[PDB]
Design a protein around this ligand. Sequence first.
Ligand SMILES: NC(=O)C1=CN([C@@H]2O[C@H](COP(=O)(O)OP(=O)(O)OC[C@H]3O[C@@H](n4cnc5c(N)ncnc54)[C@H](OP(=O)(O)O)[C@@H]3O)[C@@H](O)[C@H]2O)C=CC1
Ligand SMILES: NC(=O)C1=CN([C@@H]2O[C@H](COP(=O)(O)OP(=O)(O)OC[C@H]3O[C@@H](n4cnc5c(N)ncnc54)[C@H](OP(=O)(O)O)[C@@H]3O)[C@@H](O)[C@H]2O)C=CC1
Ligand SMILES: NC(=O)C1=CN([C@@H]2O[C@H](COP(=O)(O)OP(=O)(O)OC[C@H]3O[C@@H](n4cnc5c(N)ncnc54)[C@H](OP(=O)(O)O)[C@@H]3O)[C@@H](O)[C@H]2O)C=CC1
Ligand SMILES: NC(=O)C1=CN([C@@H]2O[C@H](COP(=O)(O)OP(=O)(O)OC[C@H]3O[C@@H](n4cnc5c(N)ncnc54)[C@H](OP(=O)(O)O)[C@@H]3O)[C@@H](O)[C@H]2O)C=CC1
Ligand SMILES: O=C(O)C1(C(=O)O)CC1
Ligand SMILES: O=C(O)C1(C(=O)O)CC1
Ligand SMILES: O=C(O)C1(C(=O)O)CC1
Ligand SMILES: O=C(O)C1(C(=O)O)CC1
Ligand SMILES: O=C(O)C1(C(=O)O)CC1
Ligand SMILES: O=C(O)C1(C(=O)O)CC1
Ligand SMILES: [Mg+2]
Ligand SMILES: [Mg+2]
Ligand SMILES: [Mg+2]
Ligand SMILES: [Mg+2]
Ligand SMILES: [Mg+2]
Ligand SMILES: [Mg+2]
Ligand SMILES: [Mg+2]
Ligand SMILES: [Mg+2]
Lengths: 330, 329, 330, 330
Amino acid sequence: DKTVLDANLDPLKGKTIGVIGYGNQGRVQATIMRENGLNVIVGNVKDKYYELAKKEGFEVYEIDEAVRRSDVALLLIPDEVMKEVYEKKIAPVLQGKKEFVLDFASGYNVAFGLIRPPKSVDTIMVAPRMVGEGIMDLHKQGKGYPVLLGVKQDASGKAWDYAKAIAKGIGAIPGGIAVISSFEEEALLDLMSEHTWVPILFGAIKACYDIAVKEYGVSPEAALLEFYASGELAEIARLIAEEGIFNQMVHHSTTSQYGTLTRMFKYYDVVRRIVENEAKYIWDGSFAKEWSLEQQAGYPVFYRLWELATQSEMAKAEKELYKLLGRKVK
Amino acid sequence: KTVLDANLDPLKGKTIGVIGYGNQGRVQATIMRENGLNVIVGNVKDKYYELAKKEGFEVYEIDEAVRRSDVALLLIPDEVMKEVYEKKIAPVLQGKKEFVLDFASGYNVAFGLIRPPKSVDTIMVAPRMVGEGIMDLHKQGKGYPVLLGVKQDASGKAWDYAKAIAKGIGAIPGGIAVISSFEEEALLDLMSEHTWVPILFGAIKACYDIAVKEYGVSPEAALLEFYASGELAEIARLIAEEGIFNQMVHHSTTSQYGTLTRMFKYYDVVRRIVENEAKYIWDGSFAKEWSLEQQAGYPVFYRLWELATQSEMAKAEKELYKLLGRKVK
Amino acid sequence: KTVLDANLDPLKGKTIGVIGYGNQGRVQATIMRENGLNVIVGNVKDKYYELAKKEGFEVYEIDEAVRRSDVALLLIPDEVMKEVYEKKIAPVLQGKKEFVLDFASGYNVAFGLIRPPKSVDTIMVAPRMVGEGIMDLHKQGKGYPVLLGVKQDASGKAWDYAKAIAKGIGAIPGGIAVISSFEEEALLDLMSEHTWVPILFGAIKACYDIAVKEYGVSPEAALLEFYASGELAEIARLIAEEGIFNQMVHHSTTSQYGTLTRMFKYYDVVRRIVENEAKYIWDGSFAKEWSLEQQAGYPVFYRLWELATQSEMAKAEKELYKLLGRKVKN
Amino acid sequence: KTVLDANLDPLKGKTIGVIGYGNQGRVQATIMRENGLNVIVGNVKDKYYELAKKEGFEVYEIDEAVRRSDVALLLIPDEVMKEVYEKKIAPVLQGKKEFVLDFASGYNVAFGLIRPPKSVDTIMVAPRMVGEGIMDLHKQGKGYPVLLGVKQDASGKAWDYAKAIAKGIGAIPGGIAVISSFEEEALLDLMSEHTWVPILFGAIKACYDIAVKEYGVSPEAALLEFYASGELAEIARLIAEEGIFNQMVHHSTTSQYGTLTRMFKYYDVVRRIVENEAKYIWDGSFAKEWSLEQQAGYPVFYRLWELATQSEMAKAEKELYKLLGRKVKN
Ligand SMILES: NC(=O)C1=CN([C@@H]2O[C@H](COP(=O)(O)OP(=O)(O)OC[C@H]3O[C@@H](n4cnc5c(N)ncnc54)[C@H](OP(=O)(O)O)[C@@H]3O)[C@@H](O)[C@H]2O)C=CC1
Ligand SMILES: NC(=O)C1=CN([C@@H]2O[C@H](COP(=O)(O)OP(=O)(O)OC[C@H]3O[C@@H](n4cnc5c(N)ncnc54)[C@H](OP(=O)(O)O)[C@@H]3O)[C@@H](O)[C@H]2O)C=CC1
Ligand SMILES: NC(=O)C1=CN([C@@H]2O[C@H](COP(=O)(O)OP(=O)(O)OC[C@H]3O[C@@H](n4cnc5c(N)ncnc54)[C@H](OP(=O)(O)O)[C@@H]3O)[C@@H](O)[C@H]2O)C=CC1
Ligand SMILES: NC(=O)C1=CN([C@@H]2O[C@H](COP(=O)(O)OP(=O)(O)OC[C@H]3O[C@@H](n4cnc5c(N)ncnc54)[C@H](OP(=O)(O)O)[C@@H]3O)[C@@H](O)[C@H]2O)C=CC1
Ligand SMILES: O=C(O)C1(C(=O)O)CC1
Ligand SMILES: O=C(O)C1(C(=O)O)CC1
Ligand SMILES: O=C(O)C1(C(=O)O)CC1
Ligand SMILES: O=C(O)C1(C(=O)O)CC1
Ligand SMILES: O=C(O)C1(C(=O)O)CC1
Ligand SMILES: O=C(O)C1(C(=O)O)CC1
Ligand SMILES: [Mg+2]
Ligand SMILES: [Mg+2]
Ligand SMILES: [Mg+2]
Ligand SMILES: [Mg+2]
Ligand SMILES: [Mg+2]
Ligand SMILES: [Mg+2]
Ligand SMILES: [Mg+2]
Ligand SMILES: [Mg+2]
């Protein structure tokens, strides 16, 4: 229903695009838009990334200089420090604008109300659902990739004619898929993966090791070679991506199939209660209050939990094994 | 403990017979063919025989391979090793005054489903690898890990065989080889297929069923974030080659902080899950669950593919790939 | 939705192979011979054969019969069908190019105990009827209900057969036919024999064990009120004729008020009894319970008669029938 | 294990910069000037300066002092050390090639609130003493205990400094010095101010609130038995001289038996109180609780003073001291 695959590039012919940020994002969406023939500029603080970006012909300006030069901008800076740069530099300028847009990449700072643009402005979202550099490994092929789209304010009548038209210029369409969503759904799916099935994976290996070694008499050097020092995860995911999450398992054996399914439906009702509680804790914005306060205090907890992980009983006896193998490692 | 090398000299004058020619047969066979070792093959005559007839091997019947040789590698599955030991092979091994029997994975020994005689030496060589990449890793000359173990020894040299085998299947020198048992491997090679495999698939199934049903989300987008992307295919490449707690410097703090605060918040539940799942295996209460299913007709095994492959998630995933250009089943 | 009629020509010009001649075999058999149709009768040779040879039918052996015919009605139980498909029939069915295998109870398909090949059609025709009365009804001319379903179709005409068979077994036109699956066939045909059958027998056993041993009642009277009378037939005949909430006007309000006030007071308990009993069947965790019992020697099945048939209730029941003149136990 | 002595030459030939002149600054300061050592005294100028200029010391401003010297003893609280490192000092320390920063309480390091650079050594020297009695002890000649630790070393001599400092502050030889970390420094220094301090004050508050309001007791007597007398000091002086399980022979059996029978009856409850109170510190979930309070305006710390100082106990205590002649509240 909401599938979107093609859209014209005609609105932007005659409009300036101001890229913001030149991190490991800006070098991708800007370049794919440069060799697609659109007058585009760049804005950053001056560091190694400007000197790099000075070696590429880009018309780098200061930030507030670009955002009075241009017509639209792709605010490709992290979800951490977009608040300071909108509050301090940019937003006192946008009242000097009357026909303008502000294209975001991660809506953590909109759906939770941390930033509030005015009403004479259009806001949109263009989120690559892709690692970001693999795009450059793929865009040469002419095969695009998925994106996401959304709107907060449309005080110009043509928010969608911009958003649908942007994705055609960053190598996403025609050739891939473009999906229609909001910011409120953008931040949830972007967060619920970083809260629910990521740590519960790392939380099990930590407890399939702490049970195999300290209780059941197992060699530490072997316990890791079965969990996550082999090509299991490195190729379980490639198969899930290209075949089907419930269609790869014919490749494995029945002893691997039967034990999986009998225990997947046996624990669907105790990760449900983990996720329901972890989504209500985000839908209500009770995570921004947790993460926005940590930046004020000095990162006191974020500093400790690295020193428990990186000094535990697993990493200690893992760090030696890679020394006994010869990997590229700490 | 670790072994990193051992001479191939015990196995210059004895016959190796590999059984099975499947995902693992060709690779431990071919590598030992190019390493100067008179080796043979034994199987039923089928499509895997036919190319194996096109490869110069002495592909023979099973019990003829085992009156011929004194050593063999029984690379057949953990399911139907029992039928072939009780029926075809084991009545022969009484007629072998000395022999060695090299298993691959010890699901059929540590649980006592098979019991070789006492005039025999049992050993173990388990590739901890994907299986096919080993051949690409034989050409390179970079080996891979293995596991070793013993059930019964009546030669004083159960180890000089096992250590010396792994030198000849492209595992060492260049990789390592770790010392374990059958009892320890059938746990690690099962407790992965019980604990962190399903609880992964059990969360996506409930991070979707909560997003579409209760929170008003597009189905086509819910899949593009979880596991239809390039994400999952490279968070493993980094965990494998950098460190499970050292990839995270690449992500941002919004991705690091939410992870760690919730990993230590749930270590006391997946611990409580795995304790139950290990006691349900250490006591052999899984072989009784899996050996009975084979005897009934696979009745539960047949249903649970029919729920997974007809659920609310796969229905809308099976179509999104049609909107990308990938196959369907 | 609702089927009422279909042709009969898709089966004319073709042979039908009746398998089994039990208390259901003869019914669908004779009705199709009374309709003038070339049908054969495959069986093992016992008293049912010598009977079945006195009835004019042609008998061949099973693997000869299913070869001779074009479709067959495998009217053998759900218990020893697995042995006869595995041993005799199924090695023959690869020697055919179009064929059908008409089942009666799909307990042996939906649970995957049998798996027919790819070049074959599978269907279901379940008489939802007493079975014996159908002969008492074919001498009347009014049909009866059936059920229909498909497991696989490789002819494009899995339905023009199934819809057409039911007209030939005295079910339509005049009754109806309902469209379902095998997966729904076994559930409804099992949820009755798990949920409201035993809970009925489980209450009488506990309305007797409470009236005699705790409240001082004559045993000869406790049975005359529960189930020594035909009053249940006057609840069943009326429920079949009038309506399960319309047979109660015929009773009095003292019988209505106590019923309804307690039907809704316990709907929230038999719900939980049934939810557990349906999840224990949908997942196939009953075939594993019933297919193992056959393999052990029927050890539990043998005991539970000797508790029922030697209990406190049947003892004092078996004598009261001797004190009436009904069939005391053979 | 147990340190008892070390050299003093690694600091001779190098200046020492005393920061802070509080009730701890003067002590380690004067003892090092009494030992004939070139030391300076960096401070803000207040009554502690004018004092500190009357004592002969050289005062410079902070960023002038820490520039002048080679090492410094940052004897300022754990509360406003973050502001002075962030604002003044730390931008200077990149202009040095070898330096040391000797702390006193590692609440501001182990919780990551401060992060010194890579070209710097960090150490810990914690007086485990009242602090004022050290001057009463330096006029005696007997030293006292300390603690030692390291956060980073880039000289190979993080220990020949730390071991050597403690000899210069009247701690060794004659006392001892113990080897620990910052992470253990803050825990033991906090677990005492969380666990056995309040549970003491929490019992007297509930041995008074039960004796007066429920069991009919004179308020003027309930205090004279608990803590109006020096009997606590007669329990503390003896525990320091004799042994925490050897001060009890001096008491009677009625005082011995009731103690021990109830110490082991409640060891399994204060265990659970402390396990929760240590996991709430090891994870740094206290700095997030204390660093936020400073930002809001101290709203809770103002209230909980007004409940204690207006309670039912202090009211009738503040008058009894007026009825004795001790320091009634200022
Ligand atoms: N796994 C991941 O982390 C992935 C994230 N993404 C998204 O893709 C993009 C990632 O590109 P990446 O290159 O990783 O971004 P980086 O963080 O790598 O670079 C950030 C950019 O912002 C500038 N910058 C950083 N901090 C500040 C600051 N405090 N004040 C001002 N400017 C600052 C940087 O330096 P200068 O200004 O000198 O250039 C640079 O241009 C982001 O939008 C991210 O959300 C999507 C997929 C993968
Ligand atoms: N899954 C993996 O990647 C890993 C596998 N292993 C172990 O190695 C072995 C691999 O098993 P798998 O890869 O499944 O082998 P395959 O299923 O890949 O091939 C099966 C082989 O066994 C023969 N075979 C199959 N069924 C029968 C039977 N019923 N009777 C007789 N012969 C039969 C086949 O035909 P023919 O007889 O004509 O050859 C073929 O040679 C297992 O022991 C497994 O534990 C080790 C590490 C990981
Ligand atoms: N209970 C009912 O009223 C209902 C019945 N049905 C279905 O109709 C069928 C009725 O089965 P049922 O009534 O039990 O049949 P019967 O028990 O009435 O008669 C059994 C038939 O099967 C043959 N037979 C029995 N055991 C074997 C065996 N071990 N090997 C070979 N042949 C055997 C018998 O002998 P021979 O082969 O010599 O004839 C006879 O023909 C079932 O599928 C049931 O689900 C449908 C609706 C309700
Ligand atoms: N309190 C105790 O029971 C003991 C504490 N300690 C430890 O030793 C140190 C003692 O701290 P404390 O005794 O509280 O020091 P004091 O409170 O005794 O004196 C405070 C010192 O710091 C300076 N100062 C106070 N506030 C500020 C400020 N906001 N900005 C700049 N300078 C300031 C004061 O004025 P100026 O700068 O003008 O001198 C003075 O020199 C801490 O590290 C503590 O952990 C050691 C033993 C016992
Ligand atoms: O915000 C994040 O961390 C991303 C994710 O969805 O994983 C990259 C966008
Ligand atoms: O079938 C199994 O047991 C294997 C596993 O991955 O655990 C392949 C070896
Ligand atoms: O035996 C069975 O399964 C039947 C039932 O009534 O449930 C007769 C069909
Ligand atoms: O037998 C019945 O149904 C009666 C009732 O109304 O309770 C006694 C008449
Ligand atoms: O810093 C603290 O909190 C101290 C304590 O009372 O334990 C003074 C040392
Ligand atoms: O106050 C006490 O503890 C005494 C006792 O005998 O218990 C008087 C000494
Ligand atoms: Mg994210
Ligand atoms: Mg993610
Ligand atoms: Mg496995
Ligand atoms: Mg595995
Ligand atoms: Mg039934
Ligand atoms: Mg029924
Ligand atoms: Mg303290
Ligand atoms: Mg203290």
